[PDB]
Amino acid sequence: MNLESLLHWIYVAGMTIGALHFWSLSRNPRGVPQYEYLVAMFIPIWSGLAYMAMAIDQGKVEAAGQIAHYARYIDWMVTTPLLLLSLSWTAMQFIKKDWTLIGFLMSTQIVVITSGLIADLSERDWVRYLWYICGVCAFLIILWGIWNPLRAKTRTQSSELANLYDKLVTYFTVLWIGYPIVWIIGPSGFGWINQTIDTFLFCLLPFFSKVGFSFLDLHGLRNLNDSRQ
Amino acid sequence: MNLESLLHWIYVAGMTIGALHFWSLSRNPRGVPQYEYLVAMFIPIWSGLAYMAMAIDQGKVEAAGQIAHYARYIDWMVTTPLLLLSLSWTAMQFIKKDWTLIGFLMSTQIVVITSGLIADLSERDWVRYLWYICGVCAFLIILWGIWNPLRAKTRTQSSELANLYDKLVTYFTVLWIGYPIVWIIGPSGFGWINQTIDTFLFCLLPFFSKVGFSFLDLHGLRNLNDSRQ
Amino acid sequence: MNLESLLHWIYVAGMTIGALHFWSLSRNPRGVPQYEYLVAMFIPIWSGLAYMAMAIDQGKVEAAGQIAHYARYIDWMVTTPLLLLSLSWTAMQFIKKDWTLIGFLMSTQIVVITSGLIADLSERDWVRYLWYICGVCAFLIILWGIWNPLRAKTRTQSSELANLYDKLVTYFTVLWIGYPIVWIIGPSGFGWINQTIDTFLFCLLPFFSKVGFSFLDLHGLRNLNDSRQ
Ligand SMILES: *C/C=C(C)/C=C/C=C(C)/C=C/C1=C(C)CCCC1(C)C
Ligand SMILES: *C/C=C(C)/C=C/C=C(C)/C=C/C1=C(C)CCCC1(C)C
Numbered sequence: 001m002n003l004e005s006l007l008h009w010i011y012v013a014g015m016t017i018g019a020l021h022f023w024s025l026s027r028n029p030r031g032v033p034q035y036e037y038l039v040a041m042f043i044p045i046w047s048g049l050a051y052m053a054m055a056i057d058q059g060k061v062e063a064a065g066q067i068a069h070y071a072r073y074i075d076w077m078v079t080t081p082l083l084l085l086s087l088s089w090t091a092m093q094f095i096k097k098d099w100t101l102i103g104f105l106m107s108t109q110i111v112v113i114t115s116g117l118i119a120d121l122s123e124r125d126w127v128r129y130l131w132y133i134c135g136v137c138a139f140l141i142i143l144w145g146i147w148n149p150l151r152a153k154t155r156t157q158s159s160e161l162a163n164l165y166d167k168l169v170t171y172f173t174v175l176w177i178g179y180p181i182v183w184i185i186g187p188s189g190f191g192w193i194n195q196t197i198d199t200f201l202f203c204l205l206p207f208f209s210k211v212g213f214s215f216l217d218l219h220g221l222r223n224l225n226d227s228r229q
Numbered sequence: 230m231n232l233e234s235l236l237h238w239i240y241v242a243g244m245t246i247g248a249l250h251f252w253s254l255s256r257n258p259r260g261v262p263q264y265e266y267l268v269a270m271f272i273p274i275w276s277g278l279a280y281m282a283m284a285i286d287q288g289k290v291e292a293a294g295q296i297a298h299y300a301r302y303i304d305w306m307v308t309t310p311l312l313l314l315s316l317s318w319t320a321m322q323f324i325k326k327d328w329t330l331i332g333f334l335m336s337t338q339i340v341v342i343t344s345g346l347i348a349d350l351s352e353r354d355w356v357r358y359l360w361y362i363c364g365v366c367a368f369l370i371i372l373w374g375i376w377n378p379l380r381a382k383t384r385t386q387s388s389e390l391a392n393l394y395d396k397l398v399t400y401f402t403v404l405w406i407g408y409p410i411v412w413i414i415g416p417s418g419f420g421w422i423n424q425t426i427d428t429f430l431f432c433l434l435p436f437f438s439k440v441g442f443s444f445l446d447l448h449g450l451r452n453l454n455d456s457r458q
Numbered sequence: 459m460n461l462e463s464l465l466h467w468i469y470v471a472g473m474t475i476g477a478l479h480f481w482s483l484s485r486n487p488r489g490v491p492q493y494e495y496l497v498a499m500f501i502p503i504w505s506g507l508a509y510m511a512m513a514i515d516q517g518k519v520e521a522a523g524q525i526a527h528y529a530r531y532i533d534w535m536v537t538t539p540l541l542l543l544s545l546s547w548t549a550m551q552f553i554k555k556d557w558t559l560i561g562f563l564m565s566t567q568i569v570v571i572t573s574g575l576i577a578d579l580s581e582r583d584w585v586r587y588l589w590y591i592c593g594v595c596a597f598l599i600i601l602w603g604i605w606n607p608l609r610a611k612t613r614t615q616s617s618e619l620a621n622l623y624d625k626l627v628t629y630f631t632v633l634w635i636g637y638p639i640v641w642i643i644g645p646s647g648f649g650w651i652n653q654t655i656d657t658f659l660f661c662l663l664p665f666f667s668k669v670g671f672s673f674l675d676l677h678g679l680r681n682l683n684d685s686r687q
């Protein structure tokens with residue numbers, strides 16, 4: 001709008017080349033799940049065009065003098081659900097049983113996204129303080145509910161898979177808790193920081209959450225097979 | 230906090246403890262297997278935080294002087310689809326190449342929800358009368374279309390499962406028809422009612438709709454086994 | 459109030475009887491099994507009620523003196539995904555372990571519709587010029603990515619099915635490119651054409667698309683097999 005703001009723009013170029021990297025990297029999975037990078041390719045693609053809008057200021061609406069971050073949560077409505085789901089496929093190379101684990105995960109997932117949905121669509125800073133806690137609370141019960149079965153449930157299913165998923169949830173906990181932290185104080189919450197740095201922070205974090213997550217999947221399996229015939 | 234309600238607040242309270250009641254009953258289920266409780270667990274959870282918002286007045290926008298209840302249909306945009314799907318899994322234990330039945334019910338479902346979607350997002354009381362007929366219309370075609378195949382198509386598939394379903398659709402119709410009733414005249418009710426009582430009626434109805442199906446599914450199967458191997 | 463455009467009213471009318479024509483013809487289809495008609499049944503029904511609203515002037519919002527085509531893209535959020543999906547099932551009769559081809563086209567379609575939303579939700583004719591390019595940009599990358607495997611990948615998979623899909627994508631490409639064309643110049647895209655014509659054109663195109671693909675699906679298989687008794 002007023003130019004001199006190529007922050008969200010450069011972000012776009014970063015996500016674009018990100019997926020292209022896998023295009024030439026196809027030399028990879030040669031007899032092993034291709035779908036792995038497939039879903040991991042769509043995640044950055046969609047999320048890429050999203051930030052592109054944040055640059056052209058196409059997605060915000062003026063309501064009661066308060067700027068609504070509609071496009072902000074939107075991106076967190078498509079990438080997040082697929083980010084946690086991408087982990088389900090990573091561990092489960094084959095499924096046919098009932099939907100108890102993936103289901104309980106998808107359910108609590110909806111309630112969480114809902115929190116951030118209105119969190120950014122908050123007109124008053126007083127009402128936002130309540131919805132914020134509502135989000136961490138839901139994540140508090142599920143977190144403790146998944147900690148025990150992290151190795152207790154797979155005690156009879158698969159011990160090896162337990163170790164892999166053990167470190168997998170480790171990082172998943174640091175990132176998911178990362179956002180809530182910045183939401184505590186500062187801009188868009190309770191601070192004396194300019195609204196400029198506000199977006200500048202919520203931009204680098206996601207990018208830091210995508211990259212780190214990518215290397216995680218590659219380190220999870222760590223295997224190079226060559227068989228398809 | 231100037232709004233004297235505290236009703237929507239007490240609603241979410243009893244909802245939280247509702248799902249927790251099962252957490253303690255996990256020692257052993259009754260009537261239906263774990264997976265059944267899984268879906269029946271997410272229904273109250275999400276719908277719970279929803280009402281909590283209705284208390285803090287979080288979910289209402291003023292446009293042209295007319296208030297919109299976008300938060301109201303939202304709760305009926307998540308629970309309802311799962312209310313129609315939950316019952317589907319109640320009768321169908323295993324699935325492979327049979328999806329024509331679930332696909333036909335899911336499709337007509339989207340049409341109904343869409344009705345209530347705009348029904349509340351109406352700016353004029355004149356246009357609302359038109360969109361209303363549209364909702365009941367599609368409901369009358371699917372109803373008469375599901376009444377006959379209730380025991381006609383299941384005459385060869387399964388006669389036992391036919392009787393069960395016959396009792397299911399019974400309470401399913403009286404409820405689905407209950408809402409459009411109050412939707413007839415008056416301020417979203419039977420008329421001669423205020424705005425306060427209005428939200429109160431649409432509050433108890435869902436609570437009566439959720440609790441009804443809960444005990445319905447349990448009594449539906451009524452097996453009570455004790456095998457785990 | 460104040461009638462002027464009854465085209466949308468007559469649009470839904472012929473749409474209702476359209477799906478009903480197959481209701482009586484259910485005694486026997488045009489070759490494709492009942493399931494094929496199932497998905498093909500929801501496409502017209504839903505789209506019917508959509509236009510019906512356009513007639514009652516319910517779906518557009520007056521903001522900044524500009525008219526928003528909210529309901530316009532809405533139908534392109536549910537119908538479009540089903541327009542291609544229906545074709546996916548037509549080619550893939552049975553499925554077990556794949557989620558490669560389907561999962562690919564599905565993701566690419568998510569980013570496409572996205573641009574279609576903001577396209578009509580644009581507040582400026584300048585920003586809408588950039589968002590559009592994004593839509594066609596992703597369409598070209600995926601197009602060239604499906605052209606080569608359209609016969610290369612199916613060279614060993616299925617030669618017979620390859621030919622069927624070869625002609626399927628042909629018409630699918632013309633229509634998909636059809637809209638982008640009209641979006642270039644004219645109304646809602648820098649032009650001296652009346653606004654009344656804008657809707658008149660964007661209404662006849664979908665109707666030309668739906669009917670076109672309908673006959674296509676029936677011509678794709680063109681075979682009769684009686685095996686039930
Ligand atoms: C790629 C972008 C990602 C993975 C963004 C993730 C955002 C979250 C996991 C946010 C979580 C939150 C809570 C758990 C409590 C409520 C506040 C939120 C939305 C920041
Ligand atoms: C748990 C909440 C539920 C099950 C809410 C259900 C709401 C309906 C079944 C509404 C149905 C309607 C029609 C059938 C006609 C159009 C008006 C509606 C939306 C009230």
Ligand SMILES: *C/C=C(C)/C=C/C=C(C)/C=C/C1=C(C)CCCC1(C)C
Pocket residue numbers: 534537538541570571573574577590593594597633634637638641664667668
């Ligand atoms: C039944 C209605 C249909 C199938 C409508 C389809 C619309 C499209 C395929 C639009 C495609 C577009 C692009 C590929 C980029 C330019 C923007 C759009 C939305 C016109």
